[PDB]
Scaffold this motif. Structure first.
Motif, short mmCIF file in Angstrom:
data_model
loop_
_atom_site.label_atom_id
_atom_site.label_comp_id
_atom_site.label_asym_id
_atom_site.label_seq_id
_atom_site.Cartn_x
_atom_site.Cartn_y
_atom_site.Cartn_z
N UNK A 33 42.04 38.57 39.41
CA UNK A 33 42.77 39.80 39.00
C UNK A 33 42.75 40.90 40.04
N UNK A 34 43.23 40.57 41.23
CA UNK A 34 43.06 41.39 42.42
C UNK A 34 43.46 42.87 42.31
N UNK A 67 45.05 36.89 43.32
CA UNK A 67 45.44 36.56 41.97
C UNK A 67 46.28 37.71 41.43
N UNK A 68 47.60 37.56 41.54
CA UNK A 68 48.53 38.65 41.25
C UNK A 68 49.22 38.42 39.88
N UNK A 69 48.96 39.29 38.91
CA UNK A 69 49.62 39.18 37.59
C UNK A 69 50.71 40.21 37.45
N UNK A 70 51.93 39.73 37.18
CA UNK A 70 53.10 40.59 37.12
C UNK A 70 53.82 40.73 35.78
N UNK A 78 58.85 44.17 39.77
CA UNK A 78 57.69 43.54 39.20
C UNK A 78 56.50 44.45 39.46
N UNK A 79 55.79 44.79 38.40
CA UNK A 79 54.60 45.63 38.52
C UNK A 79 53.40 44.85 37.99
N UNK A 80 52.21 45.21 38.44
CA UNK A 80 51.01 44.46 38.06
C UNK A 80 50.43 44.96 36.74
N UNK A 81 49.83 44.03 36.00
CA UNK A 81 49.31 44.22 34.64
C UNK A 81 48.05 43.40 34.44
N UNK A 82 47.18 43.83 33.53
CA UNK A 82 46.12 42.94 33.04
C UNK A 82 46.19 42.96 31.52
N UNK A 83 46.70 41.86 30.96
CA UNK A 83 47.16 41.84 29.56
C UNK A 83 48.17 42.95 29.29
N UNK A 84 47.90 43.78 28.27
CA UNK A 84 48.81 44.91 28.01
C UNK A 84 48.66 46.12 28.98
N UNK A 111 47.38 33.81 50.86
CA UNK A 111 47.87 33.00 49.74
C UNK A 111 47.98 33.91 48.51
N UNK A 112 49.17 34.01 47.93
CA UNK A 112 49.42 34.90 46.81
C UNK A 112 49.77 34.05 45.61
N UNK A 113 48.91 34.09 44.58
CA UNK A 113 49.18 33.48 43.28
C UNK A 113 49.98 34.49 42.47
N UNK A 114 51.08 34.06 41.85
CA UNK A 114 51.93 34.98 41.10
C UNK A 114 52.18 34.41 39.72
N UNK A 115 51.78 35.19 38.72
CA UNK A 115 51.85 34.81 37.31
C UNK A 115 52.57 35.89 36.49
#
Ligand code: CA
Ligand code: CA
Ligand code: CA
Ligand code: CA
Lengths: 296, 296
Positions: A33-34, A67-70, A78-84, A111-115
């Motif tokens: 969760x970078x 570890x990029x969550x979008x 696209x903006x980053x989030x952690x759950x809500x 290396x960029x993980x995108x979820x």
């Protein structure tokens, strides 16, 4: 310049590794969760904070996996989030930070993980994937070839680890199955398979055994060059308590790092950790980088 | 001019396909209940909306088959309906959109089904069929020839798929019987057969399997130039949301799109879908056009 002391420059540690080795084989530190480092409210922190320093610090400390969550907005962004929780970071900011690092250190790759982390905003006309791929991925910083991606092809570029469905543009590591809270093995592309240990939400003792179990598999399989091993040392929050990702990492990080330090293995995998910092002593990301000395 | 890349346009994707190929052999995206995009009322949309963008958007995203349902009015004009719902569109408007597209893209053809959707307004002069054929069909934009219609004769024109009784003027594909809610096979004229899958009002699992079964058959019968395959991915409304045409489409469109992507077939038929859009993530219409690579 190819010598063992060069692994000691954390901002340039991939420089002495031969160009022809698959990224899969390299042992690579990652951050889990970078983008959570801006979170302030201590209630928000105990539940969703996994890092305390920004992207450039993570990179200058040797992390090469992110570890990029979008979440997709109504604005084709696209903006980053952690759950809500809205982190206070956008995908474009991450990419600019990575580009700036790669310009300074052109021997490295990111290396960029995108979820997809949260449901699309109501006004969005595109899909998460068409929007990422049309507005961001088209930049020539992103490597668009596949197979068992080699270090030589990756240097100076961002290599996508897709964790979103419906990709329509070639490049990086394909989206693959990914069951919740498990250790699993599957196929990535024609040339690559993958084992992932991602048991977030097990108790401390099961977590530590799972990390070690999967690390044992990768050491014993050190010459398997087309097999990715991804090992998350991160554990999710118990909330209000002595069971935050912070509290877990303060024990897990130096424990796994000492194990590696003492075993002196030739391969440890892609080890994705919470709280990259210089705080808890035997340093995990350092021990992970040092497991590459047999490749130089 | 002459390569498979020209299938990527998609204002012009018919351009590289040889002229002597019957339209029946080509894989062609169509839109189901094409005229429903103007509906605003939420109750009405839930029951009756199947598209969210206008006709030119549909054409510019590769649709070449249009499902037109009309009603004869007081003024001896044909206006578009979805059952009792007046749509806010006339036949003349569709035809004029089609003309402009064909002027801008003269390598293409537009295939239009016409059906009588609701009883004539009681004030009206003749019949629906006589008003259509005398006031609209007489325009030389409408192809007046029949048999197994070739792309070369169709270019720059509208090809009618007659779904009304009482026709008195030659051209396009004859009305043929058409049993309700079934998949079936018949004859159209002396030179062409049809298989249609049109199970509207069946459970989700049976629908997805009916789509695939018909598509499996068409991909297996690729050299059958004599044989039209019409496959409707659309499902009718349950009172919704959660069982809307929109709801079903959000899942069916990408699922079939991905099935085609994975299978790489040389023929998939005339695939008539709800909600042509860029919202869901592998694109059904794109994957159907791409299945024409073998023809070039
Ligand atoms: Ca996450
Ligand atoms: Ca192998
Ligand atoms: Ca209809
Ligand atoms: Ca046949």
């Amino acid at each position: 310049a190819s010598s063992v002391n060069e692994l000691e420059n954390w901002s340039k540690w991939m420089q002495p590794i031969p160009d022809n080795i698959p990224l899969a084989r390299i042992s690579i530190p990652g951050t889990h969760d970078s983008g959570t480092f801006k979170l302030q409210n201590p209630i928000k922190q105990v539940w969703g904070m996994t890092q305390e320093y920004d992207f450039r610090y993570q990179m200058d400390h040797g992390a090469r996996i992110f570890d990029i969550d979008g979440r997709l907005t109504d604005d084709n962004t696209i903006v980053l989030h952690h759950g809500p929780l809205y982190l206070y970071v956008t995908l474009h900011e991450f990419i600019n930070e990575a580009k700036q690092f790669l310009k300074d250190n052109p021997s490295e790759t990111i290396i960029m993980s995108l979820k997809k982390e949260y449901e699309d905003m109501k006004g969005a006309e595109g899909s998460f994937s068409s929007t990422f791929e049309k507005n961001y991925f088209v930049d020539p910083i992103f490597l668009k070839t596949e197979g068992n991606i080699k270090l030589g092809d990756a240097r100076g570029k961002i290599v996508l680890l897709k964790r979103y469905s419906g990709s329509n543009e070639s490049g990086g590591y394909n989206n693959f199955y990914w069951p919740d809270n498990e250790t699993f093995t599957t196929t990535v592309n024609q040339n690559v398979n993958v084992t992932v240990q991602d048991k977030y939400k097990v108790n401390y003792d099961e977590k530590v055994k799972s990390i070690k179990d999967t690390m044992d598999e990768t050491m014993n399989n050190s010459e398997d060059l087309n097999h990715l091993y991804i090992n998350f040392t991160s554990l999710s929050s118990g909330g209000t308590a002595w069971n935050s990702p912070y509290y877990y990492a303060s024990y897990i990080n130096p424990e796994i790092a000492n194990d590696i330090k003492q075993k002196n293995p030739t391969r440890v995998g892609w080890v994705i950790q919470d709280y990259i910092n210089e705080k808890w002593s035997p340093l995990l990301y350092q021990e992970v980088i040092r497991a590459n000395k047999s490749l130089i």
